Design a protein around this ligand. Structure first.
Ligand SMILES: CO[C@]1(C(=O)O)C[C@H](O)[C@@H](NC(C)=O)[C@H]([C@H](O)[C@H](O)CO)O1
Length: 161
């Protein structure tokens, strides 16, 4: 089940495996693209942030994104996505988290990520062409968990390692 921790790297994870990310600091957590119709980066925002513009390096380039976190005590993982190379980034599906864990998976023509509020999370997805060959760059330590053991992954997202 819990295979890891692996150090930050760029690689091509197998389909139907959750990549469980364990960031320690605010900032970019993971990014991945098919270079055609899907770019996805996940940003971790600290608790209690009123609307402000921050700079992030996404896919090697500096980007300005306006972020907020309305929670007093919980972290906020935000997926920032664009659907063409020169498109603007939009924000989707936050996960408000106490344990600071997140996960992403390539499955059935989509990229899945976690969503909602710990300790009662759900999942959401994004349709992605050539989903199986998407390389991911992790900016923190990570673990690999098969989809068959999603119940274990969900437990860690909700309650921590
Ligand atoms: C086209 O419909 C879908 C999709 O991709 O299959 C449905 C999906 O539920 C939705 N996910 C979320 C989190 O909203 C997704 C995004 O809006 C879009 O991918 C962002 O680019 O759109």
């Amino acid at each position: 089940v819990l295979d890891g921790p692996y150090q930050p790297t760029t690689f091509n994870p197998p389909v139907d495996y959750w990549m469980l990310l364990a960031p320690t600091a605010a900032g970019v957590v993971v990014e991945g693209t098919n270079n055609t119709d899907r770019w996805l980066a996940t940003i971790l925002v600290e608790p209690n942030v009123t609307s402000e513009t921050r700079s992030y390096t996404l896919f090697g380039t500096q980007e300005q994104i306006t972020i907020a976190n309305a929670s007093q005590t919980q972290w906020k993982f935000i997926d920032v996505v664009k659907t063409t190379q020169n498109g603007s980034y939009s924000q989707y599906g936050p996960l408000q988290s106490t344990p600071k864990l997140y996960a992403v998976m390539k499955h059935n023509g989509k990229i899945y990520t976690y969503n909602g509020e710990t300790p009662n999370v759900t999942t959401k997805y994004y349709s992605t062409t050539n989903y199986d060959s998407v390389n991911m760059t992790a900016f923190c330590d990570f673990y690999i968990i098969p989809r068959e053991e999603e119940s274990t992954c969900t437990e860690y997202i909700n309650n921590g390692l």
